[PDB]
Amino acid sequence: DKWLVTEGLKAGDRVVISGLQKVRPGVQVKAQE
Amino acid sequence: MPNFFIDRPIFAWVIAIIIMLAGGLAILKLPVAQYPTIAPPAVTISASYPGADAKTVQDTVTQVIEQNMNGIDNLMYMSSNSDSTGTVQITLTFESGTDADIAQVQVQNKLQLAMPLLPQEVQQQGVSVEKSSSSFLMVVGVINTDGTMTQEDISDYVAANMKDAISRTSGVGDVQLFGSQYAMRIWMNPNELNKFQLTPVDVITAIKAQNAQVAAGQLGGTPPVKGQQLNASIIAQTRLTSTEEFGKILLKVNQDGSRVLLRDVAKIELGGENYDIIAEFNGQPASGLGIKLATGANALDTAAAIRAELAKMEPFFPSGLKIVYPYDTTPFVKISIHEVVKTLVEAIILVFLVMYLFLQNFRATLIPTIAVPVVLLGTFAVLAAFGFSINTLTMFGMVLAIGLLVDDAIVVVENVERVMAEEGLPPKEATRKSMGQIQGALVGIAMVLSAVFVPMAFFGGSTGAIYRQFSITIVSAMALSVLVALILTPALCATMLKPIAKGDHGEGKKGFFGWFNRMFEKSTHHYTDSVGGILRSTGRYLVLYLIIVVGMAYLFVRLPSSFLPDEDQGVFMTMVQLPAGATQERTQKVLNEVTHYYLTKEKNNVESVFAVNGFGFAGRGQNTGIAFVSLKDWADRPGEENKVEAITMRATRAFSQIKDAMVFAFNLPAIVELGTATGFDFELIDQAGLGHEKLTQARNQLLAEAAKHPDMLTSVRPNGLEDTPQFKIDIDQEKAQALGVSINDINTTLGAAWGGSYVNDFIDRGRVKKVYVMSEAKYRMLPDDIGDWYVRAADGQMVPFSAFSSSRWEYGSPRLERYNGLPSMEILGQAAPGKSTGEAMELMEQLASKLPTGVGYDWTGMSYQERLSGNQAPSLYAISLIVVFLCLAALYESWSIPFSVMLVVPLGVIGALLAATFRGLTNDVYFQVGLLTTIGLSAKNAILIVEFAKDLMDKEGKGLIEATLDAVRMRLRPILMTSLAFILGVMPLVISTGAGSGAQNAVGTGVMGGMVTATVLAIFFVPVFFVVVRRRFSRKNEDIEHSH
Amino acid sequence: DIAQVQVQNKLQLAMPLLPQEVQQQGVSVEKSSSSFLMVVGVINTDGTMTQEDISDYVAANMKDAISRTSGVGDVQLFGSQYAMRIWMNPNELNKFQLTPVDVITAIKAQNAQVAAGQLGGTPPVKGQQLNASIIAQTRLTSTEEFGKILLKVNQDGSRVLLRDVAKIELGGENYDIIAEFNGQPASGLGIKLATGANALDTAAAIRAELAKMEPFFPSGLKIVYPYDTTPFVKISIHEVVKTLVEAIIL
Amino acid sequence: LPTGVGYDWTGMSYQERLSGNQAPSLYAISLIVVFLCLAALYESWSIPFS
Amino acid sequence: MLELLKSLVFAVIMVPVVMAIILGLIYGLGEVFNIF
């Protein structure tokens, strides 16, 4: 269900996955994982 | 004529009787709905080209049809949607009153030309031509109370045993399914193919040749030989009734004759033709049928016609099925109307008391009582012969007519008693001179008031019909009241009144009645006692009038102007939208959290929810969701908080806390198009064929510029859908054909597998249903799966895609549009509140003007009509000033005396503004129409007061003051009989809460203040206007008594 | 319309009596007027375009809306819409041993628009994250593109192309028609009033429709109004109301 | 009849069903209107019976 | 049955009042203009 991505991301990166409405770029956000 | 029926009352009553009979057979037979239909007709066509993107759809179908669409009348515009569902909807908007049937004709007669052109995938998936509203009439849910039927279980039974019917029944513009029909689904395993070395095609034709309806003919058919003793048709391969017959389909015989079957290569199972949709009814598996009312057809009669087809079906329901009616728009219509019936009745009663408090006798009070219904009843037939129906406003013309109707009798009736008060003549004779002196003004007054209510029925555009409802019914009963006042009432005064002695005002009476008449006369005498001193100074009050009129000029302008109240409908919808590429699971998940909200955080107010996945107004596809909710009756929803207005907001606020979901709850306005003050409908267009991506960067250019004026723009949004990564195979052709594989088979093996495909028909239980082949989901889930698909080349060797296939990510739009045959990016926003419509639109157009080369743009819908030449109203009211005056100076045969009359208009205009402006209400339809009511009355007294005082100075020799006084005091009592009778008439509505209470309060209050300030302010102010203009434009020895 | 209906009704009877392509070609019934309301002409005055250049920009950017216009019951083009002209050299086919069949049959391959469905579409497997629209072959918008349509290849792949025999270029659907205007190359529209309309009004929305189009006209593109009936009926009515006035005085 | 068995009347039965309801309601209308008029001619709530 | 007996009283009880209202208006107001 996931993408392997050869590049551009690193370990420990918290993926902002959902919330595609409440998140426009740059907006502050409270993570959930 | 009164003298005629005075001698012929039975011949009179028989007239009133008759008017009650026709009206009776009128009332039975008229249509009912909430409103006149102002909805402009349009036609929809809808395509299915399964498995496709919107792009493919658009190009091989949409524009195809577009290039055919021409030379058809009353086209306003055409809108179109292509989508990756493989779907089309092309809407063509036609001028109102344009013929629905024809439009469907003329369009489809074009359409058939493109048909042979359209992809066969289109032709068998079929197309549809719908004349219907963009909105559903009612939702009807279905479930298994026993849970013995799953959704598809419920889906199909609806489909075959129900759907066609509601789709046949007249009045239904469309039957939308929530569910799917069963199909014979064929689920492919490539590795079984290649292990058996085959292609989907291999599966397919075999279905055809081996799913067959054939006609061997008949043994001994015609023509025969001579002597043939035997005749029979021949019976050959039959359409398949079941899976098993499919699985035993022969992919081929072999050289040895070895079978290769289907059930080895595939899963055969029943299923919904498309699975795109799911609903549940308050949280369990369900299906149902979205209903859209036939354009021009009548809901209430449509709806009930729907509930007959169902009830017919109920006996034959299998175990557990139950009909549930999550959404029905009809019941608010019916209920809020008969609340006009109660009021009309209850108001009828209220007359009888007021008349009684005055008359203090049984029979007498009947006389004003029986005239009211006859004319109200008499006006229904008018609706019929003019070809009207029943509705909100017309039913409101009924009440607003009473105020006129009831004033007529009283004035007629009171007059007859005064002649008996004054002269002691018996009623039978007392009627005649009473009638004789009033018979001229009753008539002429009917011509003036008409000049008030006639001008409104010419209102331009859509609104034209709205206000037009009243003027006809209102001028209907106005005509009628007179005729009855000339015919019925007099014979009622002759027969049904007490004679009275000369000089008896009721004083000798013992009890509250005497005490009552004993106070009234002392409230009158002191009352005149002012209008005496009031006219000892004419001037001081002229300034007191300047004050008021400016106050009137202060509020009316300050009072906001709007269109029609949105009434709580006790039913609503939450639209959900999810980003593209979203799996139905990502939508399904939302639904619960949305539903879940309706099942708890609102319980009491919530009766039910029937919610969906994959559908909404979109169209189809998984990232959309909608919820039909049932609220219990208003009776279960007390307080402003428990209404839909309130409820929605909480929801709107709450859902906001969710991730991934353009969601909002809404409750639809009085009309889709009709807007008192909302947002707009705008179009970016591609004139140069610039291309979508150029538009988005043109559109996003507009929004980004748009969004910079919140003080003007607000909520500016694209209606549609951003691009999404796609899976794009680029076939190396030479390789393939270097391999000897055939493209179509490649393509074929693709769309059918990854997009599904429709083979042919079959039967389920005597019923036709559709065949489908497609990849077992697990195989079609993902990109790599392509290389699982192997192909027979010229050499028989089964060849993968991945060798001749190469694929990539990239964008395409999930959804696509055009408008009137050009690419359109629709955009929705609204005026920054405190900004009035055009101001937003100006800045829109302005913001559009700077856009890159070759960019066009357009407006439609609300903004379409917006170009309307409104503002014909002021021109007409101005006109209506002129008829009124002239008619006075006609009735009065003087250019001056009309002026003493017309000065009263601001006194009732002021009163309504106040109360409405006290309560929080608006300047609107209901408010305007009642002022004209407050006018017509408040003008009617200022008319009659003037008729009297003048005839006094004209017929008798009373001097001015002595004449003016006699007019009003003689006229004091009738007025209070009209006003108070009328005041209470409208009381139920000012107290009204619940269904219909929105219109009503506006009706009542805007009436309440008007008549109040009509009543007491005027009767002071009229005597002054007579005398003042009387004096100013005076002449000769006039003033002091010159008699005779 | 009613007329249109009974006709439409009987006509249905004879469609099965039609040879197929007529049916496939389709049979239209249209309220007709054999006299165009007007004609609006066009040119490029910097010459930067040809009569075909003008021919097509019309049909595409204008006619249908001109067609959809209120009061327009029929339009007739003077011009033609571009449609790809593939020019078959027989001797170069035989040179390559090929046939128009060879040159057609493949056209259906390249210039194909295919429906591929989706990744993980419905009915899906649960837990599915991604759903996407597969994109299969698409239409070929340009000369270069058809040319690279592939008649065939060899097992080695040697490429026998559409253009691998004859040329290819755009051109009008037919070269049948030509208009000049004052001897200047021209393309134009036959313009018929739909039966029933006020033509004073139609034409104005027609002009209106043009004031709409003009901003988007290419450079040197020009409209001309070679034929119109309105200017007459304008003065006629005037000429009449003139008589009204004097009649009043005399 | 057995389960799954419906019926429909139709044709002259379909019509004979709907236009039967209409007969009496008209006679009364046809009775009412008739009495009224004479009473107008006669000014009598009885003589019309004669 | 009690629906109407519910409104019937009130509907009657207010009649004198609102009439009593306005007779007092013309009482108080008729005092306004002789004053004014």
From Swiss-Prot, chain A:
Superkingdom in the source lineage: Bacteria
Compartmental location: Cell inner membrane
Family per similarity comment: Belongs to the membrane fusion protein (MFP) (TC 8.A.1) family.
Function: AcrA-AcrB-AcrZ-TolC is a drug efflux protein complex with broad substrate specificity that uses the proton motive force to export substrates. This subunit may act as an adapter protein that links AcrB and TolC stably together.
Subunit structure: Monomeric in solution. Homotrimeric; interacts independently with AcrB and TolC as well as AcrZ. Part of the AcrA-AcrB-TolC efflux pump.
Protein name stated in the entry: Multidrug efflux pump subunit AcrA
Organism field: Escherichia coli O157:H7
Residues of the full protein shown: 345 to 377 of 397
Curated annotation (Swiss-Prot), chain C:
Induction text: Positively regulated by MarA, Rob and SoxS transcriptional regulators (at protein level).
Stretches assigned to the Periplasmic side: 1-236
Keyword check for Ion transport: no
Compartment(s) of residence: Cell inner membrane
GO CC field: efflux pump complex; membrane; periplasmic side of plasma membrane; plasma membrane
Positions of transmembrane segments: 237-250
Disruption phenotype: Loss of susceptibility to contact-dependent growth inhibition (CDI); inhibiting cells still contact the target.
Family: Belongs to the resistance-nodulation-cell division (RND) (TC 2.A.6) family.
Cited function: AcrA-AcrB-AcrZ-TolC is a drug efflux protein complex with broad substrate specificity that uses the proton motive force to export substrates.
Quaternary context: Homotrimer, with large domains that extend into the periplasm, interacts with AcrA and TolC. AcrA may be required to stably link this protein and TolC. Interacts with AcrZ. Part of the AcrA-AcrB-AcrZ-TolC efflux pump.
Stated name of the protein: Multidrug efflux pump subunit AcrB
Organism: Escherichia coli (strain K12)
Full-protein positions shown: 101 to 350 of 1049
From Swiss-Prot, chain D:
Domain of life: Bacteria
Gene knockout outcome: Loss of susceptibility to contact-dependent growth inhibition (CDI); inhibiting cells still contact the target.
Subcellular location as annotated: Cell inner membrane
Cytoplasmic compartment residues: 39-48
Induction per the UniProt record: Positively regulated by MarA, Rob and SoxS transcriptional regulators (at protein level).
Listed transmembrane segments: 22-38
Family stated for the protein in its record: Belongs to the resistance-nodulation-cell division (RND) (TC 2.A.6) family.
Protein function: AcrA-AcrB-AcrZ-TolC is a drug efflux protein complex with broad substrate specificity that uses the proton motive force to export substrates. (Microbial infection) Involved in contact-dependent growth inhibition (CDI), acts downstream of BamA, the receptor for CDI. Its role in CDI is independent of the AcrA-AcrB-TolC efflux pump complex.
Subunit structure: Homotrimer, with large domains that extend into the periplasm, interacts with AcrA and TolC. AcrA may be required to stably link this protein and TolC. Interacts with AcrZ. Part of the AcrA-AcrB-AcrZ-TolC efflux pump.
Protein name, UniProt field: Multidrug efflux pump subunit AcrB
Natural source organism: Escherichia coli (strain K12)
Protein's gene: acrB
Included stretch of the parent chain: 851 to 900 of 1049
From Swiss-Prot, chain E:
Periplasmic side: 1-7
UniProt keywords, alphabetically: Antibiotic resistance, Cell inner membrane, Cell membrane, Membrane, Transmembrane, Transmembrane helix, Transport
Topology class, membrane: Single-pass membrane protein
Cellular component aspect of the GO annotation: plasma membrane
Biological process terms in GO annotation: response to antibiotic; xenobiotic detoxification by transmembrane export across the plasma membrane
Compartment(s) where it occurs, according to its Swiss-Prot or TrEMBL record: Cell inner membrane
An example molecular function term from Gene Ontology annotations: xenobiotic transmembrane transporter activity
Organism domain of life: Bacteria
Transmembrane segments: 8-28
Function: AcrA-AcrB-AcrZ-TolC is a drug efflux protein complex with a broad substrate specificity. This protein binds to AcrB and is required for efflux of some but not all substrates, suggesting it may influence the specificity of drug export.
Assembly: Part of the AcrA-AcrB-AcrZ-TolC efflux pump, interacts directly with AcrB.
Homology family: Belongs to the AcrZ family.
Official protein name in the record: Multidrug efflux pump accessory protein AcrZ
Gene name in the database record: acrZ
Shown residues within the full chain: 1 to 36 of 49
